[PDB]
Structure formats: structure tokens, C-alpha cells
Amino acid sequence: MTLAKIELLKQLLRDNEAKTVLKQTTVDQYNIIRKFNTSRIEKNPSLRMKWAMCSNFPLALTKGDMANRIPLEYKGIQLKTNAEDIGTKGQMCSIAAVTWWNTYGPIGDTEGFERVYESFFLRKMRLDNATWGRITFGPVERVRKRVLLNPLTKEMPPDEASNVIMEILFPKEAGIPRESTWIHRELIKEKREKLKGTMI
Amino acid sequence: MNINPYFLFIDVPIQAAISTTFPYTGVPPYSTGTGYTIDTVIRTHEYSNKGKQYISDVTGCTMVDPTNGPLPEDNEPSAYAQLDCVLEALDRMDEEHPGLFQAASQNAMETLMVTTVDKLTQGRQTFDWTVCRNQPAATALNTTITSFRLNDLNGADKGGLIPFCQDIIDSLDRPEMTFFSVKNIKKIKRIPMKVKDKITKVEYIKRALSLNTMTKDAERGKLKRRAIATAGIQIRGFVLVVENLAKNICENLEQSGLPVGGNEKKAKLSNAVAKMLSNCPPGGISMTVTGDNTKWNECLNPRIFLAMTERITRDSPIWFRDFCSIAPVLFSNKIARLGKGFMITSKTKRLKAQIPCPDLFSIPLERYNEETRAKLKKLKPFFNEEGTASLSPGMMMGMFNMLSTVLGVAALGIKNIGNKEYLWDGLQSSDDFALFVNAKDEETCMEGINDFYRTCKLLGINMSKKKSYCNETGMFEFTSMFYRDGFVSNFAMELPSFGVAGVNESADMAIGMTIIKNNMINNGMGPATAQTAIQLFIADYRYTYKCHRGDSKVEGKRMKIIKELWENTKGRDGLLVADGGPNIYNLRNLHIPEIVLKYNLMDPEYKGRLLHPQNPFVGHLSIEGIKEADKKMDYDAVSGTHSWRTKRNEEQCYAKCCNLFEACFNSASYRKPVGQHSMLEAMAHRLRMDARLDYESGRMSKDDFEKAMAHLGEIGYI
Amino acid sequence: KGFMITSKTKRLKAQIPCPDLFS
Amino acid sequence: DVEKGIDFKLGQTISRLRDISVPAGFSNFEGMRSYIDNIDPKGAIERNLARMSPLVSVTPKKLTWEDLRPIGPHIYNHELPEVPYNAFLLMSDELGLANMTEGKSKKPKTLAKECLEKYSTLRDQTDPILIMKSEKANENFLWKLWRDCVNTISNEEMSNELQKTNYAKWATGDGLTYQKIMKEVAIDDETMCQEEPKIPNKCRVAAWVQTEMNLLSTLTSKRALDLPEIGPDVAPVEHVGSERRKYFVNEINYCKASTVMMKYVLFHTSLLNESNASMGKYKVIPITNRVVNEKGESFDMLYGLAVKGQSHLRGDTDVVTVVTFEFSSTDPRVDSGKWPKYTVFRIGSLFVSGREKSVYLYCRVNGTNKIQMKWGMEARRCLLQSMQQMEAIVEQESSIQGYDMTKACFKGDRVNSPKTFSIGTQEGKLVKGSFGKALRVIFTKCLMHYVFGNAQLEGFSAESRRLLLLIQALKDRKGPWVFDLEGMYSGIEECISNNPWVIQSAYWFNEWLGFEKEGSKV
Amino acid sequence: TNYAKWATGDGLTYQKIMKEVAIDDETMC
């Protein structure tokens, strides 16, 4: 893929616009470059989704070797097509293939969900073991308060949160650790160990 | 017996059953907008026709100046705002608050020096002058950046918004203006190409000052249609800065309903009414005026906003004072585009033709309908030859919401006129104000109300005497929220939100359930109502994605596969509602994603298949929306086969450059990268390191390494 | 060939063939 | 460089624009800046007010009951025409061709085929008896189009597209459209004028609206509204919610308004599906519904057919034409004022239990768009609007006495009488109504707010809410004052033009205001 | 060419339709 990366880079540079923009915009400016998208946002998502679900192949599949696991038509039902794509450069597919994959196909690893989605399973644990009581139908006095919607493992400001996330799951690009990793070293090591062994 | 639904109000208060009055279940009204735009221009100039009429020598378009104009002698709307009174109100606000103006201006300047140009990509559709149309903000900004490169204009590459605004202001002086225009060349096929076009200085000034128009069709509770205006990218930076400053000022003001939204606004409303009830003298009356302002933007002169900006920044750097005063100047000399023009038809020949606006007066007026005849006979004085209307006075809806709110709060905060035995205070938010007047009797209450009305008329504000009323404190309405005897019914208007979110199965489901739970928390939706909402939403969700219960005899393409899966897997309580599984969601667990909810009940094969580490239905580039659902609403979902994306409905340059950079540095997609070097060299170094590591690990062959290094050397980085 | 009938308001014409001269 | 500071200086054109964009009395922006920075107002507001004319004021007038008068008196006037039936589909006149089915869900085309197969007399009827051709539609066009519809539905092939494709083009009037030319010729030609705006007619109070309001709000042995299951309820709160939900659905499900709502939703869903799937070909669409009786028999009901025109539209506001043929048991001659837009036949008769009753076909051309087309499938929210308020009602009761009353309000208990609202009237005597009947009335009100919804309805409701809140304030003796009452009244009454629901809402508002006026004596 | 079409009156020509519709239309004489 790194060879594919270099070949794609060379092909992109062959055009002069890519050469001039790449050599002009610094790394910091990249953000601006990314935000120059079409912004042709769908005006009504409900109608779009309704129409798409009735189309032959609305699903936009990423090009890869997964498709070979499933025929282009199974049990006389069309699943995927080999026609090229312009929006995503991949293939097209239908929810039929998705349902078949949920039915048959490769079997993945169940370990990752034990720890990766720890917050959700903790929510479920707090719900299941909760004890209910009576209901008081009388009027309730309520005050408007600034409340934390969800429990947090270790509340930190957004910048420290981003730095910790990068230090956890992005081993590269970790120049000069600030005065925040030492404070959260235990969290760093715990999350690092827990998330190791995954493929998400 | 003849039924009568209104009789429900005999046994119930109106506020309690207020939700049923609103027809927020039928088809909202929907639509040429040229007639409405011309009517709006006509009304805007009519209200200020007595001002000073002159001719701009920078653009040649007629201008009407109502500020410091004759004081109105009638109840009709008046834009004749006296500058001294505005400054008096601002001074009273400044005295009533400790250096609020200075703090707000300084904070606005600081956040401005940190703002980037790309912030202008947010918002809604914007007027693009290179094509003279309405285009997405991102595309319009990109096109203007590209055009500026040709005329020796730069600063977008320099980053911050200061250089972009500086070279935007510079562009107004260039003797020419070159750009790329779309040319639909005939070849029969119509192929679009880029043509290097040029326009003069006056044409460019007119294009920059022009305000595009559209019909406000989405409105729900108004019979007559209003026109919404979209401005160009050359005003977005200044309007944004002034709006941020006004937001900073108004946030502290306890009289301002904005920008706080939700239960905060209810808290403010109840707190204000309680405060006024507490402050009443003994045996006196505190009357509440339920007000609904009209012509709230056809009477506000941008010159008053220029004066307000200058007074607000009394003590600030000269450069910032000049910068933040550009938006009122651009708005005070704005021009309005005019829809797509009227349509004339002959029925004796079954012929019809739409007449473009520039040709409005190329036809004898005796052929338009009498109403449009009068409209054009009145619009002729301000009609530009190009097909635009010179609209100096007044404002279009939606531009200075915060600044207009600040002016309204300034009017509210005077609190007295002539030391008369009364006081007043209230809530104001963007064309909706509720006032409270405390006195020793009703007569003095209305003396105060009349004084406040007169004072408002001295600033261009004209409260609607037809859409407003007055009563005793403890019962009123503010921005469609009703208060009565301490009971604030959140008027149930979030009903049109239970449809599928149309992003994907799991995400749509999570969004719907979170919407249900939020409505339960906020609007007082009862448990039975929430259960029925869950039922209806699940019905619609199953229908829209053609996935009903596997047992049910319904026929469909995916339904056959769902039926197969129903018996091919033993554990039948773990399937998802997208896989014909049984619904499990209830009130107690609307806050838990179902995938984790049914994780125990699934089967090992089913969970392995659905929660595969790699899914051809899941892509990295599809993750953009995993955080916020377009208002940006946070939803919690789970990675899986049902996390797919729908098909799509210097562009490629930027797009593929960014895509490749993300694919190289996978960390870029999450957090802003940092570096003072060209992107090319960063990518080259990273790719060289990656190639060496891949080879040393045996993942790449030797010929592969040599080819990669040859390419990198050709790139000029080795 | 028959006859020709026409509506001026709709600006439409049609040919009635000889076999259909009484329909 | 930290000794310099930011540099941002205004050019020449922008500086000139600033110079000329100064309020009156100034000649340069430096002058305005100095004036604002230096001059101090110390009572300028009072100085301006001390001279402003005394002819400007809010005109504060106290509001009493007598000032409030009936809204839209022109509906009473008999010189105006009776309001017509402009709703998309028949509501209280639908005739359900009902076939018992094991429960299998089948394509609408096959369902309609079978339903007609059961009734051979109506399927094979080919000699119509014109009861009335309304004003413009052609009897030959409509009858031939309906015959093609029946033939296509009953054809062996699964295809549900019209086999003619050319007769329908003129039956639906697609070809009766103007041809667009370029602007130059229009400028040169003198006869190419501008069409005068077509204002809605000013009509009077009809009678069919009241009868439909009554009939759609009554229990029927047939139930169609079904809802998906939810997870087991383990908390007490969700147990109470389940009890309330059951008590509500046991009431709403059997009202005819629920069946009409489901028919509308299903028809619009099928219309959207056909439009998306088929773009430029005429299609046949049965108006299908599914109805379960108390015994659990899942009848499939065919209510008519509809030809869909060419829906090849890029935009949403673009209109697509559809012609509806509807089975009914009502002879329009009984009240011809209700059906001035409909061309009808008399395609036979049927026996429900031994009592023979005629069977007519109401044919009408109409047009919709993707917006209303979607809202058709979002019309189910009426149900929610029906429950929320009642929920609140019940909750209020629960606030009074501690226990839960949902059984008490609905049916009553040994300690509390059943809750009764005021629902109707007769001979000037208002009548009470059970909790379930009030819930039905609210649900039907919401359904009508949808079906008869347009700009007029919004302008009427959002502006008569002012008077509603003023009356509410008056009933609490808040002594509300008003500034311009006639302005509000004119605003409200400039919306009662031709919408049947708007006219009936005005009529009921006037009657209820009279009732409140007569009851205010205490 | 486009302008001459309407200037010369050639574009003001009645449209031919199938005999079925014409017989079924009572306004055609």
C-alpha cells in the first residue's frame, strides 16, 4: 500500500496544481485545504434515504477483496456490481449483501468489544443492577442546573483530552510530551493496554 | 348532536391545550420570488422616503438616509432614528454595567486575531459573484480565493482572517478584476468550461455589495411569504466579527434572550417574571406586554449600527475600530438582486415566457398586472440598469441578529422617562420582545407602555400594535413559549422530528431514540407518549429500510434474506430491528445503543459476523459524521455492518491532496496537524520512513523498495 | 381521407377517417 | 517587531464608502468618530420626546367581552357558494372492497386484482350511468381511463403501468400545457401579457364538514391502526406508561378517523414509492388499506384506483398529476353542493348483509408534490398530538390525588366518577362527552388540521391564537388591554376564503365565543 | 432562425392528435 501511496502521490504531483499547492501550504494550513468541500448537503435526508433504499445498489462499498466472499448475485438476488464509481471510486452494493453478511461470511473477533466500548457496557451495567421503587405522583419541584449528562472516567479539559487521546492511540507524532501525560500516566497505560489487540 | 373541538377549551385552559391549536402536522406552505423581493424593497424605501435622498458617487446607485431624519408624526413604521438618542441609550447601558463594552470588544478582538479564514466556510448558502448565483459557502469561498490569486491578492494562504479582510478591502480598488466564469459551450451538448473573464471596478463594487434573494418557503405559521437574503463572501468576515462582538455584549445582559437556547431560556423567562413580581410596590400593578415586533429589519438603518459599533469600541486600537466598522458601511450601501423576473403569457396562442429582471422595464408597463404595474412604477427610481434595486436603508432578515437584540436591550434598559412613577424591564430576542411595566395603577402602566413605545420609535424599532397585547403579569408568551401561573408549557412543536435521520440504520436509530429521550426530558412528553413515539418510530424505521420481523409474511428483496437469517440463527432475541429482530427498547434504556443492549442475547456467530473488525460496508472516510448528526447533535452508535454510507448525488486538487494527506498521516483526520513546512516534504519523509519500515519488516520486496525510492528521488526528497 | 375537426382554444386538430364519419 | 502592532488600514474606495455612509448632518467619518467619542448626551431622549408629535401612541384600550365579535361573518352570508370538497381522498364516503385474507402481505396490484375478482359485477361493469359531469372534465376521457385502469389491474402480467400510454396523456391533461419561448419574442409581441393573480373564492359554511367531523369520530367494529411491539417493561414507570398506552389505543384504534389516516399514509407511501421507482411512465396505484376486525380476520380493503402521471421532476416543489377513482355508496344528488369538483358514475350495487345499496365511482383529477407526498407518510404524528395533551390531562388529575387515575378518567372507579368534557351541542344545549370521545375529537381535529392544511390554515391558526389567548386572559380576569383590535380581526379574517376546515373552525369559534359570553355572567 | 419561427407564424400551428382522443373530445369540431 505504501507503494500504492507513492504511485498515487507521483500521479497527483504530475499535475502542476498539486505541485504548487503542496509546496505552498504548510502543514498547519492543511486544515483550511480540507474544508474546501462542495457542501452540497442533501436538502431533505428523509426523502433521499427513502429513495436510496429502493434503488438497486445504493450502498457505496469500498474497493477491496471482501467482495469476492459474496457473489454479485446470490440465490437469484442481485447484491453487488462491478461498475466503476466516481463519487467514491469504489463499488456499489445493496442491503441484501449486508443482510447476508449478518447471516453468513467471515467470523470476527469478539474480544475487542469487552473493553473498547467500556462506557456503553458500564451504562448497561448501571441500568441492569439498578433498583426501582415507588412512584410519587404529586408535583415535583425542579431547579435548572448545569449538570454533567454522562459520567466520565477522568474529567479533563478538551485540549488535554485530545493530547491524551493522541498519546494513547497514535504512538507516532508525539513530540515533546507536555505537562499533561505525567498527570494522566495511569489512564494512558490503562487505556493503552485495554485497546491493544484490536483492529477497529 | 354536532361535535365541536373548541369546546375542549371550556373544560381546559388554552395554555394546557395550546399544542392542539397549532397545525404543525400538515404540509408547510411552499412556493416567483421577484415579486416579493420588489415588494420588500418598495416597503423598505417607503418607510424612509422622507429621509435625505442622494446619489452615491462610488457606485452611482440612489441612497436614502433616514438617520437623524424628521421625527414621525404617525403610527406608521419609521426608520428615522436619532443618533443622539441611540448614543444616550448606549451610555446608559455602559453606566449600568462595569466596563462591559471594553471587555466584550477586547475579547472579540482576541478571538478575531485567532480566527482562521476557513471559519467562513460554515453557515448556509452564500452569494457568489463570479457566477452571480447562490453557492455553498465552502465553494463560494474557494472560488473567491482562486479569483483573488489572479489579481495580485493574497492573505488566504497567510491563514488568519485579518489578511483575508485586508486584501478583500484592497480588492475594491483594483482598476480591473479577473476571475474564472462558467462557460456552457455548445458542441448537441452543453459542456461547462472555465473562461478567464474580467470586470471593471464599478461592476465589481456592485457585485460585492449585491444581496441575493430567495423565498422563505420553509415558514410554518405565516400565510404571507417573506424573502430571505444571502450575502457574499466579502461581507461574511465583517458580519461575523460584529455578530461575535454583539453576542459577547448581549450574553452578559440579563435582558437578552439570545444566544441561550433550551431550558436556559425558560429559566431566564421565569426568573425575570419572578423578579418583576418581587419588585412591585405595595398594591401596585405589574403589567406584561406580549409584543411581537413587525418590520423589525425594514426600519433598522445600518448607519445606526455603525454608530453603535463605534461607541461600543470607545477604547480600543484604531485598527480594530476601523475593521469592525466595515460591516455597517457595506450594509449601508448594499444592493439587492431581484429573483428571476416575472412571467408573461398569451392564452390565445398557448405561449409563455419568463422575463429576466434586467428587462423589467424593456416592456410597456401596461402589460404587467395592475399590482406589478404599481410595483414597478414605484421601483423605477431605484432600479439599476443591470437588474438590481438600490436598497440602502433597512436590513434584510437574519444578518445582525445579535446587534439588533443589543439595540432592543438598550431600549429596554432605559427603565424610566421623566422620572415618572413607574419602571419597565423585559426580555428581547431577535424580533420578539416581552415587556414588564410596574406602577401604582393600570393608567400609569399604560403611560409607561406608551413612553416605551415612543422611545422605541426613536431608534427605528416599531412594535406591532396589531400582533401585540397587554395583560396582568403571570400570563404571556415569549418566542412561542407560554407562561401562565408559573406553568411554562414547552409548546409541543418538536413533533416533526421522529422521522428517520437518513444517515444510516444504526445512526438513524440512535438519533431517533436520543430525540425521544431529550423530548421526554425537556417538553414534558409523558411516558405513554414516549412509548407510542417509540412504536411509531420503529414502524417507520422498519418500513423505510425494508426490514420487518423475519416471522412476518411480508415480501421483499432483503426480507427473504431476513427470513433466512431468522431460522439460520438460534438466538432470536439478539437480532437488530434492521435484521428483523424484536424491538427491545423502552423508556428505561433509551440512553443505551441497542448493539450493546443486545450483545448478551446475540449468538457467537452472529456477533462475529456483524461486529467484524473489517467490514466492506464500513469505511474510514465514512466516519466524518460519527460525532454530530446534522444543528450538530451528538449521538452514540457502534461500529458494525450497519454503519454504512449512502451513494453520492481546484476541486479535485484540494480534495485529493487532503485525502492523501489523511491516508498518510492517519492522525490528521482527528486533530489539527502542526508544522511549519510544506506538506510535500512531510509526506515524502513519512513515506520514506514507512517504506524502510515495511521492507525491514518483510512486508515489501526489494524491487518494491527500489521502485519506491526511485519515485521519491524523482519527487526530490531523498 | 374523411374530414378534419379542430379546437381553436386548445389549438388542436385531428382527422376523422371515412369509416368514422358517424361516430 | 512587537513594538509595531497589527496593521490594518482602509483603502480608498472603502474609505469613501465610509465617508458617504455617515448619518445625516455629518460630512466625514472622522467627524462622526470625534462626535461619538466626545459629545455626551444627558437627556437627548427626553428632548426628542418633548417635541415628538402627540399623535403617535400605542392607543391603549381595555378589552371587554363585548368588543370580541364573531370572526369572518361572510361565512354566514348565503349569497356565497357552499365550500367544496377539496381533500385528496374521500374520508367519510370511502367504500371498502373488503376481502378476507389469511394475513399474507401482497403487492398492491395483486391485492386490487383479487378484490375486483371477488366482485365480478363491478369489475366487468362497462356501461356507466353519468350522475354528474362537474364543469370541465370529459366523461369519455374519465370512463375510458377507468376502464384501462381496471383492465391493467386485472391483467395477468404483474406490471402495473397503463397499457395505453397515449389516451391517458389527454385524459390527465398533460398535453394541455403552454410552450415556452425565448424572452426576445415575448418582448416584441404585444399580446403576451401577465396572468392576473387568481384569488381564492369567498365561500360559505357547508354542511358536509360537520357530518364528516361527527362520523370520523365514532367507534367502528373495524380496526386498522397497528403498532410495533416494544421491549418488556420492568420499571413501575413504564408499567404505568403501558397501562395508559393500552387504554388510549383501545379507544383510538376503533375510530374511523384512524382508518382514514392509515389509508392516507399508505396511499402517500405507495405514491412516493411509485414516483421514485417510475419517473416518466403512467402508473396505476390502488388505494389500499388493511383492516383487522375484533375476531382477528385481516381483511384487505380496496378503496379505488389512481392513475399517476409523469413524475420526472428534479425539484421537489414541482407538481405531479394524479387522477383518483373512488368507490362510494353516496349518491351525490342528495347534496350536490359538496361535489362540484367530481365527475361520478353509478357502477352498480352491492349487498353488505342483505340491504342492497348502490355503488358509485367518484373520478377527479388532482395534483401533488414531493413535499405533501412525504408529509402524507408523516401524518401519523396526529396520533402523538392526540396522546400528549390527554397525557397531560391525566397527569394533572394524578397531581390532585396520589394514585393513578387512567382507569378513573376513562371508565371511572368507586371513588371518582368518569371524566366528562364538553364535546358538542344540540338545540342550543351543550352536551358532555366521555374521556374517550374527547380523545377521539382531538385526534380528528389533528387529522383535519393535516388534510385541510395549506397557507390559509396556518395564517388562520397562528393569528386566531391571539384571540384565544386574549379570551383565556379574560376568563382569568387579568383585564387584558389591546392596542388595535380591528387589526387582529382583519388579520384573522383575511384567511377564511375557501378552506373547508378554516370555515368550520371559524364557525365553531364563533359558537364557542357565544357560549363563553353567555356563561360569563357568573 | 428561432426568432423567424414566431415572426413568420410557422410556430403557431395546431397539434395533431390520435383519432381516439378527438372522437372522445366534444369540443373539437
Side-chain angles (χ1 to χ4, degrees), chain A residues 29-47:
Chain A
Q29 313 293 36
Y30 153 88
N31 273 106
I32 302 110
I33 305 323
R34 192 209 178 167
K35 297 208 79 45
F36 293 172
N37 281 328
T38 47
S39 287
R40 263 187 163 194
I41 282 168
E42 179 55 6
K43 292 184 178 185
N44 188 330
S46 322
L47 290 158

Side-chain angles (χ1 to χ4, degrees), chain B residues 84 173 292 345 369 418 555, chain D residues 13 35 46 104 193-194 466:
Chain B
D84 306 85
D173 280 12
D292 289 333
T345 204
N369 58 56
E555 297 150 47
Chain D
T13 42
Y35 172 93
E46 307 210 312
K104 192 172 189 333
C193 310
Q194 193 194 34
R466 319 284 178 194

Side-chain angles (χ1 to χ4, degrees), chain B residues 515-708:
Chain B
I515 278 274
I516 288 170
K517 90 197 261 291
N518 293 336
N519 277 285
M520 225 153 49
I521 292 172
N522 309 132
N523 303 17
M525 179 155 90
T529 42
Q531 289 188 317
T532 287
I534 293 159
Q535 283 185 328
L536 302 178
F537 160 81
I538 277 282
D540 173 281
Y541 170 95
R542 280 179 182 160
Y543 144 80
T544 318
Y545 305 163
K546 323 301 195 226
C547 42
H548 304 100
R549 302 183 66 103
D551 57 6
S552 65
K553 311 320 196 192
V554 50
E555 297 150 47
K557 296 173 68 55
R558 170 169 190 175
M559 271 314 327
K560 168 176 152 186
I561 330 180
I562 288 174
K563 294 203 171 253
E564 275 180 289
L565 155 64
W566 182 279
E567 84 291 7
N568 298 159
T569 313
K570 180 258 171 189
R572 278 150 169 208
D573 305 343
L575 306 106
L576 290 90
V577 290
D579 300 0
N583 187 2
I584 194 172
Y585 266 151
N586 220 305
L587 304 197
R588 83 188 156 288
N589 61 2
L590 295 171
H591 63 294
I592 283 160
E594 141 191 348
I595 305 96
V596 54
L597 214 171
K598 301 190 188 158
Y599 188 87
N600 313 106
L601 309 178
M602 282 184 190
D603 269 326
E605 300 88 344
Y606 183 40
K607 66 181 68 162
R609 291 174 191 131
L610 167 56
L611 297 175
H612 211 68
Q614 154 58 319
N615 292 319
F617 334 107
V618 183
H620 309 264
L621 302 163
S622 98
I623 297 162
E624 255 201 334
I626 283 193
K627 190 192 193 161
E628 289 149 327
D630 292 345
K631 273 192 176 183
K632 289 215 183 178
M633 194 217 102
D634 301 349
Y635 75 84
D636 301 40
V638 177
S639 98
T641 62
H642 312 279
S643 309
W644 44 251
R645 226 182 184 175
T646 86
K647 54 180 160 201
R648 293 206 185 177
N649 205 356
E650 303 63 38
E651 170 226 2
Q652 277 167 2
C653 163
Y654 287 148
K656 260 161 166 154
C657 273
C658 93
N659 179 6
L660 161 73
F661 191 94
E662 307 230 333
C664 263
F665 299 85
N666 288 33
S667 81
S669 85
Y670 163 63
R671 198 199 61 162
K672 152 164 192 70
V674 280
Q676 293 177 155
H677 48 287
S678 317
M679 288 170 48
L680 177 58
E681 101 195 66
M683 308 163 112
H685 298 181
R686 154 57 47 110
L687 289 166
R688 184 175 165 161
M689 192 165 178
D690 281 342
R692 181 183 70 92
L693 295 172
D694 278 340
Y695 164 90
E696 287 174 3
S697 62
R699 280 179 252 163
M700 223 200 326
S701 77
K702 190 187 173 191
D703 292 355
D704 293 9
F705 177 80
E706 284 187 10
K707 215 176 196 179

